Amino acid sequence: NPTYFFTFGDAYSQTGFSASGTQPSASNPMGNPDLGIGTTTNGPNWIGYLTTTENASLVLSYNLAAGGATIDNALVPAYPGDLASQFRLFEDVYADKPASAPWSAEDAVFGVWIGINDIGNAYYSTDAETYTPKLISRLESLVEEVYKNGGRKFLFLNVPPTSRSPLFLEQGEEVVKQHAEYLSVYNENLEGMVDDFTKKKGDVTTVLYDSWSFMTKILDDPTAYGFPDATCINDDGTSCIWWNNYHPGMKYHLLQAEDMKPKLRKLGGW
Domains of the chain: 3-267 (3.40.50.1110)
Among 43, 41, 25, 95, CA closest to 64:
95
> Residues with Cβ < 8 Å from 180, sequence gap 6 or more?
161, 163, 164
Among 123, 113, 25, CA closest to 67:
113
For strands 242-244 and 247-248, give the pairing: antiparallel
Among 239, 235, 190, 236, CA closest to 212:
190
Q: How many residues does the chain have?
A: 270
Q: How many whole angstroms separate alpha carbon 240 and alpha carbon 231?
A: 8
Which resolution in angstroms does this entry have? 1.6
Q: How many whole angstroms separate alpha carbon 211 and alpha carbon 194?
A: 15
Q: How many whole angstroms separate alpha carbon 11 and alpha carbon 160?
A: 13
Cα–Cα–Cα angle for 132, 137, 140, rounded to 5 degrees: 130
Residues after which the chain is discontinuous, using a C–N cutoff of 2.5 Å: none
Alpha-helical (H) ranges within 96-249 are: 116-122, 128-149, 166-169, 173-201, 211-220
Confirm if 155 and 209 have CB atoms less than 8 A apart: yes
> DSSP letter at 58?
-
> Residues with Cβ < 8 Å from 76, sequence gap 6 or more?
70, 117, 118, 121, 122, 135
Instruction: For residue 89, give the H/E element and its range.
Output: helix 83-93
Distances (CA, A) of 160 to 3, 38, 42, 77, 105: 26, 21, 19, 20, 29
